[model samples]
Target: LTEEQRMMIRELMDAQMKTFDTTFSHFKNFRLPGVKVSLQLRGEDGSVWNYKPPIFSLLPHMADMSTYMFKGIISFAKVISYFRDLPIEDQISLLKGAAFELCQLRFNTVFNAETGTWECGRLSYCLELLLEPMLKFHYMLKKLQLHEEEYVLMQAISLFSPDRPGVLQHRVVDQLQEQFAITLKSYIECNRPQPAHRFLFLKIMAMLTELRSINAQHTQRLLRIQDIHPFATPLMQELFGI
Candidate 1:
């Protein structure tokens, strides 16, 4: 809230927005393939839903559905703009909040007009299942940089220590394993794997799960380093330690 602090945050936020603009711009250039969604929906009782379309037929529509978030972000520049003036610390906090929001957000938006319920897809399910862990990993691994090795060591040490099994206590590794399972399930469902191919897919999923469990825990920790808490600041010293 001090004049000096405001100026510093404005600078940091500018950098953040620059990164966002660049990333979104890249997504604008992605190639779209036909048949984005490739699974048929069946009810719990094993009955095929009337409005559900086959995977091959659902690709184009799926592409549109997938692009909704990017398109919305592209149009809503102000939302990006708002963060562009926040302090660097607050911006970091916002990013963490966004991560939580991203994890919690529902991927399924398919509507059935007659029954008025949303239908799910193996493709959407898979993409979301893969996306969160990847995001979590990227968030921490990139943010933590050199400190990443520190956490890995700490986690290992904690696991070995009598009272503080840090990684196990946190269930960090297992959480990532679950995410990996979700990812593999999705890959098989979307790819419609031949029986022989699934064995390899399962292995790949295990590796990915291990990767995410550690990585996401790191990312969440890094994002917690907000400069100033979002709450009201008391004074210049508390607000501007840098």
Candidate 2:
């Protein structure tokens, strides 16, 4: 890389880390006010039992799992300067296309790397089954055993997706996305420093592709849930850009 490119990459890495830190700082202990994961118990006979603990039994008034996800998207959009500059129409379009993917990364924060389980909730229906999408992704990521920095870079890389169909600033977004990809590659090269690890970058990028499939499937699943529940939360409507 040229000196200028190297410098730009360095600055971009710093910005990406800073943006993530500042944007997500408040979420260090973040919780959905009314959400709780049910705990699983084992029977003395050796069978497993599933039940909601008494404290978490009182579910939230609104059971839509999508609401908490919508809130995360809103907070993310508010803090990212790139997201903020888009026109309202474009912003909504971007959210409809990319919010779930970004949410995938947020969900990653609560995954227990050591246990291959989500740190949040165990049962699928605890949060109106909103955790299903994340749970699936969590298992997929766990198998890979990615580093924390890799997750951070992956989130940043995922956010700048230029291929979202209706974006108003496609070219600008594309350039920024490419920059993020390049920065990730440089980071892996410097930190990993193993020739055998060269494929790691491609592997990480491939997970983004996998996430696209998960996003589509999760959206359809949520739509099915909406069909049964049929109650639309304000945040859900906002996220759908309705």
Candidate 3:
């Protein structure tokens, strides 16, 4: 790998360790009589954001690492279930309200006139670091749940449109054509079709949507900062302008 790639990997791994510690403390297997638990985790299939199955093993670090890597939308949905289960209108209202609260959290990070810069203490730095992983974890968790949903839809497809080849290659090929504007038919060949393929495709879509959403939100947050700090715009342009 290039120096930059290696650097990023190291940074990500360091972040992973930190997040692992936090997650391990939250999950425990203290068996309670008559309590039923349904444990589910997603596994990866040679993809960048895929993870191994979430082992129900009570090994703290392993469970933590597993959660860190594959955070689909379904996992996120469960974490924020109230908003997840709410009607569309109410969800939007909740999101907007949350955004407003995020804007209000400005105690630790402050502008300094003497230095002509923004000063972020340890807490601000930690919060900034915490942002991406939390977003990622929630997102992948949501996907885990969404895959269950997509399964139901596929079951419907099986029942109603039985003739439609129970194959995923067709759908993946279709997605590549529609989304990335590429045709995959030129070299299409698969040994067999598995329902898991549908899960993989949906996970890919979930990843892209998460990336786009996070990018949009981060850009908005940065722009919002410009409003509070008058010098933010010109300085940012000078620092980031091509």
Candidate 4:
């Protein structure tokens, strides 16, 4: 990488990591055992508006999950926007492809690798009610044993994939991805100097491919759910655009 590219990567890495830290620190697992959520808002005309939120008992966990995922993606997109060299069309296409995968990596943190279960606190849930794609992804994450830094860097790398189907500036995106890959490799070497740790970077990179497969299945299942049940929450509909 050239000096300019190197500097850009440093900035990007710092911004992405900061975003993750700030976002994750604010979020904690909370159980909403009840079914109904009500909202009250004041209008300009001094009238009070009462609203009732969607209660998808069938997919009870999705509301919280989608809200958290959307926040993370929006934060990451702010960092990605610094790449003004990339075309706007490609930037959006990259966002569409990468957002959910990055969200999945973030969500992986809540998986208790020891127990192979979500870190849901006292919230009773039916695994059978959850789509198979979600259960499979959760099970897969239990085996990875990923460190926080590894997750952060992997997310940065995943966000720059040149091979995203609709990107208009593939070459530019490819160059950026190469830079991120090299940075992650250097980070792994410096942090893990043991000879036995040589394959660590490769192993972490492999998770991205597995994540993509999980995302594909998850997306299909979500589409089916939306088709049948449809989202009553504006935020969920806006975030997923389904």
TM-score list, all predictions: 0.21, 0.67, 0.24, 0.70
Q: Choose the strongest candidate by lDDT.
A: 4
Choose the strongest candidate by TM-score. Answer: 4
What does the lDDT read for residue 169 in candidate 1? 27
Candidate 4 per-residue lDDT over residues 1-242, each given as its tens digit: 35754565567656667566432444445224354333333444777644345545535445665666666676766666445557778767777777788877776776654544444322212221224566666665546565565666677677788888788888887877787778777767767877757787887777678788877666777778888887525655653566
TM-score-best of 3 and 4: 4
User: Which residue ranges in model 4 land beyond 4 Å of their true spot?
Assistant: 1-13, 21-61, 81-84, 120-145, 232-241
TM-score, predicted candidate 4 vs. hidden true structure:
0.70
lDDT of each: 0.33, 0.60, 0.30, 0.63
Tens digits of per-residue lDDT, candidate 2, 152-207, equal 56765666676777778878777877876886787677778676576888988988
Q: By descending lDDT, how would the candidates be arranged?
A: 4, 2, 1, 3
Model 4: how far residue 113 lies from native, Å: 1.1
Q: What TM-score would you give candidate 1 relative to the actual structure?
A: 0.21
CA lDDT for candidate 3: 0.30
RMSD of 3: 22.1
> Model 3, range 28-113, lDDT digits (tens) per residue?
33221221112223223432221233322323322232232223212322233222444544333333222212211111113232
